[PDB]
Structure 1
């Protein structure tokens, strides 16, 4: 529709025509922080506009409240915005209080043109149809979804817009039915924003190994939650790695050689920086398969290394210093053993990068380091604002870690990733030991009232780490029905729970159609009925924060609602 996958080039040419000059800064990029894919997309975008010498500004934004703040203080000189990683799922034209007759210029002719473009780079679905069809200013980059799927909804939208008698009543009732069946779909991410920008770079001819690595990184960040999308996009990344890889073979390792490979990248947590033992131990998938949160699962992991013939001391060596023969042989050892434990999906081919002699890093490890920097890198409303400012400031640590000139900062990210995952694991074993999960009929509920690490889980990404750890543990059990989950943690300073509504998912190795997050609109509907003072301004609208006293009324109304 607005800009299809075939015509991102026209949008980029328009950006240069409108908003490039030696004279003035004219382009503003709003990027949702606490989103790796949006970060990588903005990095690629900023390198493009660096090479093309477009004077531009990047603002990292936490949520919709900060969006409407910052948008309200943009000068008329700013005639293009790029909204990266948010804004598709909401009527931005209404939300930002746009009037096209307040933005129109040079209409002459049956024609219109405007003093500010607002381009939207978002992978979230369902699209708000006022962005896609209603607005003449909001300009969404589409993966193909609108043309592939939304023909009936397009028809219904335009006819209901035109349809201002019994036939008339039946028609407007019908198209209201279509649009209210399209809305009240659960939320879901269908693409990587970074691969979307990579398709733009492919259309311009700007592809190179830096931009390909950023595409790989932003795409790899989807792998935990949105494995089906990652499996859609992985073959195209293989094609581009082969296309850009240089032609020399049996190449001698040299200080200048950046080599980006497809090779075995196991589903283990930070293998090349953890010990081998810790890389099994702190992996979400390994914990799910082995039930590692208890002593019997720990015994099973020891049993595994014993049957592999690996001494436990060797397994606990830091991977650089771990025995070279074991590292050369590790693929064979895994092949010969991991089917016996059901861990055969540990085997995977993923993207590994090495730059001269300073050692290999996979896209898996790199996105873990970047998330760690986002999470922990550095009157109640004021304290909340200061907290959100800390998270905005963490964005630039992840940003700077994307540059090879600052690999010490990436190493900080690696260390913080290990310690974060340790905190996740300890809180997780607390939940599963003490059985904090309550099996309500429609969804599973978990509420963290007290304990250590509670001051971490006020960050949305760290809460989602614990959620994903728990959900991997649930998915790999045939005992449990695949119910949606609510996970909450109190902030004892603000006196508000942070609450996350989480999808289930099928076990990791199996293949079906994706299952959608309907906590987003369910939370909206309860928020619309209730007197409770809940906030819903986070970009990932299935995450909210709610005052402590309001939680039990809220969850009671949630479980009495039929929306889940």
Structure 2
């Protein structure tokens, strides 16, 4: 509810001291956006050389272990991606200490709607709600100034009728789907441009941030291109090349493709594993696989030349890469492939597509790495976080490729198993919504991570619906290996075929909390996201039955 620059000067005044400082910025959690945000944030701190702690939090339940344990001198705290949904004032408590409260916890979140207790009643925040939903948002505005603090019998009856009158519309709010408005990174950059830093790798961090989520919607991002492209116009390494030159040597616009790993993998394998194209061409089917080859017969690209790594393909095919696709792809309905994208060239190393980089980092997060076992695993993910954090750095590229050799493999897993599902037609159309469960599969170790099931769930909800009449219906998935029937189940959102009228607001967040409040059968919201929960095989089936009814949508 504040100016970004002024919130900045506040976090400046409470910061620098002897001993320095102290602030812990919480990077959270598994979302690439977090990295994108906190890296340019951390670089900004290093600019004024302000000491910082930075914590890799996984579990939402895990945050309590930290904040309740170690705090001493820390008067100014910062947090990322948490608290937009569940309020930490009740969750942490707080317990006001010393107006002009000593500690300011900044909470940065893209999630909506905000918790009601957060924005109004200033204690721990210093909210980041600005500027996306301001709004009004008159529904939260009347939620308090009316409620607080609230012949005489008719005035009591009138008063109470008014109270429930506000409580109904208030109940409409805060019970709702969790949907990201704008990427937190973008706003950190809006905060950053007011201070005056135009830095190139910074901007690349923004591009990374925005393009973190294009796998899932945009939704506003379709109109974020002005806010990026203009900035790309606010700077330039040289008016003209001047090949290369070995330095600056920076990012530029190119006809990029939702196509998967075009530059770091072989072309044919790049269609065959791509996510958008899995769908339209029915590639899980042997009968459709051929249709790809017909694409190549249309392009005049040899099959043998399609099998070869993209660095080494002939030059003629490169110069025709932006034409041939226009000549052909239009006929297959694949006409939405070509985006205007961002590509940063490091020169003699190669170039990297904005999206593919994100595929590298995601790749890093799950691989390349009774409560003791889950804690130890979540711990392994915590360590792995930094292995992924390092790849963002420019000076070490040598491990970034270790991401990509993984990002390929994962797909080779994911695709494979994905097909293993469609052969058995495991989809349960049900009535109100679509649902699935993986009872068996190869290498569930890869599927342990929330984000792995976010991407498999994504290629699957993308595959089932082209569309593909009728009625985009949200999907459900489940997997188990070890940790005694943890059976991780993540919520999902429907995918429109590039024509998106409504955000549609994932409802699993609410539907799960209704069940936690009913019989709560081995239901665990331990994962940071409201869409993803844990379950046991003993209680999963009654849970599934209680999921089927009553349907909130």
TM range (shorter): over 0.9
Pairing 1:242–2:233 present? yes
Query: What is the RMSD of the two structures over their aligned residues, measured on CA atoms?
Result: 1.8
Q: 1:490, 1:548 within 8 Å by CA — same for their partners in 2?
A: no
Q: 1:33, 1:392 within 8 Å by CA — same for their partners in 2?
A: no
CA drift at 1:531: 4.3
Q: Comparing 111-120 with 524-533, which one deviates more in the overlay?
A: 111-120
CA drift at 1:232: 2.7
In 2, Cα distance between equivalents of 1:388 and 1:95: 21
| TM-score normalised over the length of structure 1 | 0.94
Q: 2:267, 2:306 within 8 Å by CA — same for their partners in 1?
A: yes
CA drift at 1:247: 4.3
Structure 2 CA distance for partners of 1:341 and 1:146, relative to 1, 3 Å:
closer
In 2, Cα distance between equivalents of 1:150 and 1:326: 53
Q: Comparing 230-239 with 357-366, which one deviates more in the overlay?
A: 230-239
Q: 1:105: which partner in 2?
A: none
Structure 2 CA distance for partners of 1:193 and 1:402, relative to 1, 3 Å:
same
Pairing 1:119–2:106 present? yes
Q: 2:86, 2:115 within 8 Å by CA — same for their partners in 1?
A: yes
Matched residues, number: 546
Q: 1:157, 1:175 within 8 Å by CA — same for their partners in 2?
A: no
Q: 2:2, 2:126 within 8 Å by CA — same for their partners in 1?
A: no
In 1, Cα distance between equivalents of 2:508 and 2:292: 36
- Greater per-residue strand proportion: 1
1:257-305 superposed Cα distances (whole Å, 9 cap, x missing partner)? 2321011111110100011111111111001110111111211001001
SS of match in other structure, 2:93: coil
SS of match in other structure, 1:494: coil
Q: 1:92, 1:138 within 8 Å by CA — same for their partners in 2?
A: no
Q: 2:114, 2:174 within 8 Å by CA — same for their partners in 1?
A: no
CA drift at 1:23: 3.0
Q: 1:269, 1:365 within 8 Å by CA — same for their partners in 2?
A: yes
CA drift at 1:161: 2.2
CA drift at 1:152: 2.8
CA drift at 1:256: 1.6
1:381-404 superposed Cα distances (whole Å, 9 cap, x missing partner)? 111001100111111011100011
CA drift at 1:88: 1.0
Structure 2 CA distance for partners of 1:231 and 1:71, relative to 1, 3 Å:
same
Q: 2:132, 2:182 within 8 Å by CA — same for their partners in 1?
A: no
Q: Comparing 487-496 with 38-47, which one deviates more in the overlay?
A: 487-496
In 1, Cα distance between equivalents of 2:315 and 2:329: 20
Q: 2:207, 2:228 within 8 Å by CA — same for their partners in 1?
A: yes
Q: 1:10: which partner in 2?
A: 6
In 1, Cα distance between equivalents of 2:503 and 2:110: 15
SS of match in other structure, 1:352: strand
CA drift at 1:311: 0.4
Q: Comparing 429-438 with 469-478, which one deviates more in the overlay?
A: 469-478
1:367-386 superposed Cα distances (whole Å, 9 cap, x missing partner)? 00010001113x92111001
CA drift at 1:479: 2.7
Structure 2 CA distance for partners of 1:76 and 1:241, relative to 1, 3 Å:
same
In 1, Cα distance between equivalents of 2:429 and 2:443: 24
Pairing 1:73–2:63 present? no
CA drift at 1:219: 1.0
Q: Comparing 400-409 with 379-388, which one deviates more in the overlay?
A: 379-388
Pairing 1:180–2:171 present? yes
CA drift at 1:406: 1.1
In 1, Cα distance between equivalents of 2:241 and 2:327: 28
Runs of 4+ in 1 over 4 A off after TM superposition: none
Q: 2:106, 2:125 within 8 Å by CA — same for their partners in 1?
A: yes
Q: 1:499, 1:543 within 8 Å by CA — same for their partners in 2?
A: yes
Q: 2:112, 2:178 within 8 Å by CA — same for their partners in 1?
A: yes
SS of match in other structure, 1:258: coil
Counterpart of 1:466 (choices 456, 465, 468) is 456
1:213-265 superposed Cα distances (whole Å, 9 cap, x missing partner)? 00100110110113223213222110111102234213320222232101111
1:107-139 superposed Cα distances (whole Å, 9 cap, x missing partner)? xxxx91112111011001111011111342222
Q: 1:222, 1:230 within 8 Å by CA — same for their partners in 2?
A: no
Q: Comparing 17-26 with 545-554, which one deviates more in the overlay?
A: 17-26
Counterpart of 1:272 (choices 263, 267, 276) is 263
In 2, Cα distance between equivalents of 1:6 and 1:553: 46
Q: 2:491, 2:508 within 8 Å by CA — same for their partners in 1?
A: yes
Q: 2:159: which partner in 1?
A: 168
SS of match in other structure, 1:160: coil
In 1, Cα distance between equivalents of 2:130 and 2:355: 24
Q: 1:136: which partner in 2?
A: 123
In 2, Cα distance between equivalents of 1:156 and 1:25: 37
| TM-score normalised over the length of structure 2 | 0.96
In 1, Cα distance between equivalents of 2:454 and 2:327: 34
In 2, Cα distance between equivalents of 1:160 and 1:253: 65
Pairing 1:155–2:146 present? no
Q: 1:263, 1:351 within 8 Å by CA — same for their partners in 2?
A: yes
Q: 1:93, 1:138 within 8 Å by CA — same for their partners in 2?
A: no
CA drift at 1:518: 0.9
SS of match in other structure, 2:435: strand
Q: 1:222, 1:229 within 8 Å by CA — same for their partners in 2?
A: no
In 2, Cα distance between equivalents of 1:423 and 1:243: 42
